Amino acid sequence: SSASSQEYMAGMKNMHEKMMAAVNESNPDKAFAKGMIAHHEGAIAMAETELKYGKDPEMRKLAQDIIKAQKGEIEQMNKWLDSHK
Amino acid sequence: SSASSQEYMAGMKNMHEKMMAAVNESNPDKAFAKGMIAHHEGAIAMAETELKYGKDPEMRKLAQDIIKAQKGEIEQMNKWLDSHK
Numbered sequence: 191s192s193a194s195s196q197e198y199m200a201g202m203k204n205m206h207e208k209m210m211a212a213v214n215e216s217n218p219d220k221a222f223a224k225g226m227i228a229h230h231e232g233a234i235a236m237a238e239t240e241l242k243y244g245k246d247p248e249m250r251k252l253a254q255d256i257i258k259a260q261k262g263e264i265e266q267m268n269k270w271l272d273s274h275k
Numbered sequence: 276s277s278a279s280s281q282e283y284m285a286g287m288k289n290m291h292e293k294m295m296a297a298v299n300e301s302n303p304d305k306a307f308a309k310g311m312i313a314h315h316e317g318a319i320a321m322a323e324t325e326l327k328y329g330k331d332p333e334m335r336k337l338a339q340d341i342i343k344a345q346k347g348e349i350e351q352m353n354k355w356l357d358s359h360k
């Protein structure tokens with residue numbers, strides 16, 4: 191019922207819907223690509239929520255590292271999907 | 276219904292349950308920790324599935340990078356969880 195828990199669930203919903211679409215890919219490489227994008231966007235969403243509501247400095251710093259790390263992997267992946275269909 | 280799609284859904288099923296459990300945490304820092312563990316286990320399962328069915332060399336290499344990189348990162352999360360309440 192809290193705002194942080196409400197924000198975690200909204201991020202999960204978005205990740206879940208995109209994850210199901212990825213499982214619906216017959217090409218396993220396209221499923222992996224689609225899947226990992228939804229995974230990375232979910233981790234950015236969890237980390238942004240942790241940076242907004244979390245109070246532990248160890249978790250807060252881990253969340254910042256995650257936001258930076260998950261962007262470079264989405265980059266190459268979007269290209270692979272855009273150059274295959 | 277394909278074997279690869281069925282193995283992707285099995286990992287998604289696993290990640291979704293633990294993700295929902297993480298969202299149900301009232302402590303937003305514990306939700307983040309549980310959430311990221313569920314993300315790491317979900318990314319490993321996708322990559323293991325990609326290593327078994329995938330044919331593209333780039334994704335398979337990306338999936339191997341995931342298994343190697345995401346192995347040490349769960350450790351620090353369980354350590355944080357096991358020393359907090």
Ligand SMILES: [Cu+2]
Pocket residue numbers: 199298
């Ligand atoms: Cu909920």
Ligand SMILES: [Cu+2]
Pocket residue numbers: 206291
């Ligand atoms: Cu569902």
Ligand SMILES: [Cu+2]
Pocket residue numbers: 210
């Ligand atoms: Cu579904």
Ligand SMILES: [Cu+2]
Pocket residue numbers: 209212225226229286287317321
């Ligand atoms: Cu997935």
Ligand SMILES: [Cu+2]
Pocket residue numbers: 284
């Ligand atoms: Cu299914």
Ligand SMILES: [Cu+2]
Pocket residue numbers: 206291
């Ligand atoms: Cu559900």
Ligand SMILES: [Cu+2]
Pocket residue numbers: 295
């Ligand atoms: Cu639920």
Ligand SMILES: [Cu+2]
Pocket residue numbers: 202232233236294310311314
């Ligand atoms: Cu999550």
